[PDB]
Design a protein around this ligand. Structure first.
Ligand SMILES: *[Se]c1ccccc1C(=O)Nc1ccccc1
Length: 480
């Protein structure tokens, strides 16, 4: 890494200087580093130029605004300081060149939208790896190669993608928030494809701001959920975008690329998805639960078909796709009730989990749950009301009561119900889960909500060893 080579596209005849790491933070700027002095909200990195110089940085790139002309080369204590206009917008490009353009050295797929970014990125990474990629994710669960995901500026994004390239990643599925795009954190990334899941005078400015940003980015092939009203607005302006539907929103008059589920059977162990597309037709056995996860799966499928993965190979590997751990994770055993373990610990997440479980449920829907102690009590009656409405049998139990009287939490939950007397209450959580699993019929579904993969139960100050997944697996005679 050399300052002169790094700046060649923008500053001819910048000085020759070996560089170590690139940093926005004067505090971690070490000998041989490139310090980048940016203006943010209130913060001005140009204040820290003397400190960075004293810590032995090789060179500094600084915001030009009010200070210097674009491309102006100064020399301070023998350290080159080069000024650039609009440094915040150009940070992604500068870091991309610093880190040897990692988005040109693997297949990068971005996913944006309110919901389904995590699931859709995990399905892209899993499916591509099943077809022979070495796949990675960058998202809210963290970054890394599949199975080794460890829990953020334009530089950090480029640096982390470069670290995955260095680890041998050939495919990366990246969550991209609306806020991420606006703050120029992915401005210079070359996406092979980008995915739109959903959105949940004003409408004119919003569209105009997003169209402007999009026109500036390198998003590759567009894959868009045509069941979303805003998604259809976007498709109307993007004739080469792939339209994806499970609710009959493909308009075949367009002669564009498309994929649509013609039939979905939600059964006790997942979903049978029959689909047609401009690549051909097929039947997928998904091990994921609910309508939203059909959509997320169809977006991943359309994306990988669009990038040229063969339909026959995608169909052959679909049954190996796994749920995101602790997210609508289904446990079935021969002639036992279906059990779903989900992390839902809010009124909205619990209602969505119950509505998703209900589709797979021929019999009674059971809901085992509780609420955290020594935290906001507001959600408790609202979660009671949700369990009473959207489940057939509500089993109210403990979930991390901490130092609060466990029964007091249960009382606050029951107070939200029309008929508290209809609720079942059982303390010990292990006991309550057992009661549901052992009483439920073969065609029932038991939702165990609130913990997902969070394998402890906090009682007083003790983090007790406890897993919903292990409890359920042992009762069903299967392996968590
Ligand atoms: Se641009 C980009 C880059 C990464 C991830 C997502 C996007 C994006 O905005 N994609 C998109 C939005 C709406 C319609 C099609 C595609």
């Amino acid at each position: 890494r050399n300052l002169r080579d790094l700046l060649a596209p923008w500053v001819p005849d910048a000085p020759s200087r070996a560089l170590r790491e690139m940093t926005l933070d004067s505090r971690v700027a070490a000998a041989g580093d490139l310090f980048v002095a940016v203006v943010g909200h209130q913060a001005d990195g140009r204040r820290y130029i003397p400190q960075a110089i004293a810590q032995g940085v090789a060179a500094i790139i600084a915001e030009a605004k009010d200070e210097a002309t674009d491309g102006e080369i100064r020399e301070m204590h023998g350290v080159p300081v080069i000024y650039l206009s609009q440094l915040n917008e150009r940070l992604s490009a500068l870091a991309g060149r610093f880190y040897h353009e990692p988005s040109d050295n693997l297949r990068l797929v971005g996913v944006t939208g309110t919901n389904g970014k995590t699931t859709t990125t995990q399905l892209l990474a899993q499916w591509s790896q099943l077809l022979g990629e070495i796949s990675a994710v960058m998202g809210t669960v963290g970054n890394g190669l599949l199975g080794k995901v460890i829990p953020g500026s334009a530089v950090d994004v480029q640096h982390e993608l470069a670290g995955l390239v260095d680890q041998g990643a050939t495919f990366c599925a990246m969550e991209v928030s609306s806020h991420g795009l606006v703050q120029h954190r992915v401005a210079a990334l070359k996406f092979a494809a980008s995915v739109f899941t959903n959105l949940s005078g004003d409408m004119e400015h919003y569209e105009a701001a997003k169209w402007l940003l999009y026109s500036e980015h390198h998003c590759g092939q567009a894959i868009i959920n045509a069941d979303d009203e805003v998604g259809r607005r976007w498709l109307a302006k993007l004739p080469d975008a792939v339209a994806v539907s499970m609710e009959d929103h493909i308009n075949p008059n367009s002669h564009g690329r498309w994929l649509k589920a013609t039939e979905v059977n939600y059964h006790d162990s997942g979903a049978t998805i029959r689909f047609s597309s401009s690549w051909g037709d097929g039947e997928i056995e998904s091990h994921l639960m609910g309508a939203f996860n059909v959509s997320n799966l169809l977006l991943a499928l359309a994306t990988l078909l669009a990038l040229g993965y063969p339909l026959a190979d995608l169909l052959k590997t679909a049954a190996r796709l796994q749920p995101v751990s602790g997210r609508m994770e289904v446990f079935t055993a021969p002639g036992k009730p279906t059990v779903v373990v989900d992390y839902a610990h809010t009124p909205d997440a619990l209602e969505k989990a119950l509505q998703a479980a209900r589709l797979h449920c021929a019999g009674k829907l059971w809901c085992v749950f509780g609420c955290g102690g020594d935290r906001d009590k507001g959600k408790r009656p609202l979660m009671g009301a949700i369990a009473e409405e959207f489940a057939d049998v509500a089993v109210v139990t403990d979930d991390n009561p901490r130092t609060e009287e466990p029964r007091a939490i249960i009382n606050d939950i029951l107070a939200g119900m029309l008929d508290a007397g209809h609720a079942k209450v059982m303390e010990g959580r292990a006991e309550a889960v057992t009661s549901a699993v052992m009483q439920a019929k073969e065609n029932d579904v038991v939702l165990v909500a609130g913990k997902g993969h969070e394998d402890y139960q906090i009682v007083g100050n003790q983090r007790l060893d406890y897993s919903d997944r292990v409890t359920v697996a042992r009762l069903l005679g299967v392996i968590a």
